[model samples]
Target chain A: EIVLTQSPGTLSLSPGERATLSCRASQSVSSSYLAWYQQKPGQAPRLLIYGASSRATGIPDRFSGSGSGTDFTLTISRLEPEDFAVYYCQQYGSSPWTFGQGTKVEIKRTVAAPSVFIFPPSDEQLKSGTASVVCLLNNFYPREAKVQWKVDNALQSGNSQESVTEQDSKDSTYSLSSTLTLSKADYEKHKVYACEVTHQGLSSPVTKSFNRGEC
Target chain B: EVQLVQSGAEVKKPGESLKISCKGSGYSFTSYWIGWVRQMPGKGLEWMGIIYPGDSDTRYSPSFQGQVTISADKSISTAYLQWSSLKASDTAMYYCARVVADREGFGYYYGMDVWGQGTTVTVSSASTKGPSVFPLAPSTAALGCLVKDYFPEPVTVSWNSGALTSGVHTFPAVLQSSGLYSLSSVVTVPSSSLGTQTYICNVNHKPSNTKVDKRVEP
Candidate 1:
């Protein structure tokens, strides 16, 4: 079995700069058996490099893979803000296949805390006997944030915390959204519904509430 | 050691039928999803589809849907990609890979983490061709450099001046029936520089040691 070790565990660089990540295997692996993937918070990992140096379909040429045998490299010619994420290298040269622990590409500046917003249910949702509220967190840096729903100050489930984070190309900040739906009766039962966001960027968890009567 | 041993390469004539196999071993083969990727000669990797050996559940990329068949046999721990008829365009290398699920076993699928030694299928074909470069200006502020009919695919295009990092979009090479490829790189320029400057399109092909520059003037 091959073990891949990625280097510089955490890389801090600004956008528009080049980023070169290294992956070294415990033993020699076939050049064509290596692959690289990029994973952003709240999203599935995306295949970027495969067959050692071949870019996967639809991948921008700016992201390239090179080298062979036990040593391989993934280079981002010019890193975009969204390119700041986690990258891992995997090998299939031999099995029980393995992956690198992953390297974090982060921004060089201070992180920004997300702003939380809890939008009240729409008229249609209010009339349909079920109220759906949307919680959005905008313009945070470093791309890590958790969202939760609470009814009348108590924790609640059935909320789909869609953790897909989107990066603002202009400001290099991240944003996320989640949805929580409840029956009208349950909505009325709870005097207030609150959206809470926790992030390292924030000094404290940010909470925004929507009153039952707002609907 | 676990392995994905793929079938030997096949040289099938156009219009002939073919089926290739990838057999998994040394692990719970029936528990993981297996996938196929296609690399047309001198091209990038394109995912064909994937199938789980456990339940034979399968999924296909829109580009490959209906174009190929994806199947798995859990009993044998094997997966296959078959074609009823082959074409010259199908001349490429194909690989099978293991689609890994999270180690925690929560069913979070990672992308293909393990790959097979690719099977090279040659329907036969191409000689090296130098690209013909041309400058295209669709608007006063937008310019494109077209590199066409290049063979054995590796070439780089850059601007001699201006910011090459952003505002530049390079389209990947598109395969042509002539066994060649064509691609274009476009960049947005400030109108201020358009009338006063000459933007150089520098194209480099290492194999042929060819380098050509085309200057686009307002």
Candidate 2:
């Protein structure tokens, strides 16, 4: 019963490949309280599932719903052209039935890279208390970069990026930015914090450090 | 003093039968709902089903409909999840959590608040034996279970017993940096209820569901 959102927005997958999509609820969603939909560019939206995983009218048996609360999934065993629609996971378990952002399922592959930058995201203070640094990853497509934080050499817990801003790149791709926060203390006693950014499109996790005046 | 301690890892062949257990103590056992969650290394979290120990009122997600079973024994303050025909695809970490109940309309809305330490089951062509049941001792003061092997924001724990309502005590579920949940509860046991096996520890885990318990003689 909450803000339902889907993951891996642009699924660049080929036919015959098993494609699995996920819809995460902000507050836990109960059983039978959620649904999934399919939308073609110009066609009306088609209901793929309801009550979490039960199939709608004409859904193929190949399309199955992963059961349970908040974290539900839609797995398409075999992709067909008729399945070529922007995927949208919806939740009607509560008032004002909510729909996650639309998903673009593509047969072709071309992902854009983002030039990541770290500036003072949270205006708190360095070596003071709870604070954050916004690691802006712009001009990135296939929006799939994970943000991680570190106090010094030891790896800190990953804080999911919020305040995401998206821009439609004129190059037919997309651009996005994120703000990563830090929580593990002792930073109030120390000043250095590293921001580790990773994308499936990247060879490895992109690691960068930030200090008081080193934006 | 209330908490949920679940059974251990197992492996089974497709279509094989299996049953996992969760024992609780430190509080009244029949006061809450107990449910299960699925986490496959191959997939994400899935809530299977839940049951009320008091009347056996149960609900299953459409996705889990007809796939498994959920049962409980209020007499012993325990809940169980069973599979009649295990599928190889069912290999995953299954955790039982206590449900938070908020009265809605005809019934109450259920959410996970406290969870048991997860139990792993690997369904394959080969069969794997299950773990031995861990025995818990009793308490004249507080009977609680420490749920280990889990995460950052764990669930809630509550206590229960047939003893007088005024004397029961419970503490909050604390999350350690190691990402584990540890909770305890101690109550003033009246001499009238001293030497009997009657106390129950119930954990109401909202993230996984609620009403996981263990019975102890106090």
Candidate 3:
């Protein structure tokens, strides 16, 4: 039985760049047994590489694993937003298969902070007794941003609709908006609306609130 | 169809004895590895330890080694995380998840696929004390605020002045090894908003709305 340990523990890199993650085995093992997996934040881990360099089914060409015995490496070229996950190496040539702790590949978060804007409704939108409030997300990078809405601090899961993101290919930035529809009578209820935007670069969601006003 | 049902929320006095349980169903319970994860108030998840119920073989992360106990009753298909003497810092949300079969010496399950709805544990004195706010003056350009003593996990500490913030920048909670967590968040407001505004520290870990009954709402 061999013990496998990952080094550097974490790797902080930017998207569209290359990253090399490593794994070291305590003792030499058969070259055919080494494998690699990726674990995204809050998601289950998935097998990415097997037989050292062969990409697993549905795995992208950007991920390539190599090296053998006590030394192994997983190289990711032109990292994508989703590729910024934790990677682990394992050996199956022997009993009691072991996994390297993990090496996280972080994407550079130079993207500017997101700006939120909420617009009030028009007479036509309000005439139906239903009003639509729009929450726009601007000046953020990476297209993988999530939009969430809350009514008075509670999740408004059923009332929100989001527009497809518009990307600026010049800088790889993203722009999008979400709309929360509610009954016009809800304004009498003093329902507070909050738009929450979650991005890969930001640790906490960028949030802004909208209140009832004549438009 | 796999299910990992957990025990209910608990409130225990410091130095009290307690045992939390996680029961597995929808599969052969003993055939998979069941492990416990901890999220202290405002902190991220930490892998506590795991047990192979089939043979009672247990492994603990170095941080939790010997600090607590891990056991299971194969007959009931349940695994346990227990403490002989609880510390006030032990308040947290603990989750039990099934680990895949990495052991060729055992069954074929691998990677964690099934997770139990979290269990909440609060270890404190009977007195109810709300979390406290501190001005962490390292004197950097960024305004610093630290909040301590919040119970249960996942407390959201934000700058809730009802005014537009430069933006609320929050860092994950830092565990004091006591299991209780302290969170830090910062907002670069106009400085005028500082004295005139408010910072709302809301702890809403009871997502299930389960009442501990004995909770005094600290």
Q: How accurate is candidate 2 locally (lDDT)?
A: 0.58
Instruction: Compose the digit string of candidate 2's lDDT tens values, residues A15-132.
Output: 6777888888887664556666665542334557766767765578877888577688888999875665577676545543356776777664367665554544233233334344
**lDDT by residue for model 1 over A10-63, one digit each (tens)?**
887888999999999989875357889886653435779876787876689789
DockQ of each: 0.02, 0.02, 0.03
lDDT of 2 by residue, B48-110 (tens): 777889899888766777988899988998999889999867877787766545433354433
Q: Fraction of reference contacts reproduced per prediction?
A: 0.01, 0.00, 0.00
Model 2 chain A scores worst on lDDT over the 10 consecutive residues at A163-172
Show the lowest summed lDDT stretch of 10 residues, model 3 chain A. Answer: A163-172
lDDT of 2 at A78: 91
Residue B69 C-alpha lDDT in model 3: 96
Model 2, C-alpha of B66: deviation from truth (Å): 1.2
What TM-score does chain B get in every candidate? Answer: 0.56, 0.54, 0.58
Each candidate's interface RMSD, rounded to one decimal? 16.0, 19.8, 14.1
TM-scores for all candidates: the values are: 0.43, 0.35, 0.50
Steric collisions counted per model: 0, 43, 8
lDDT of 3 by residue, A97-187 (tens): 5667778665555666565555544444466565655565655765567888777788877665554432333444555656566778874
What's the DockQ of model 3? 0.03
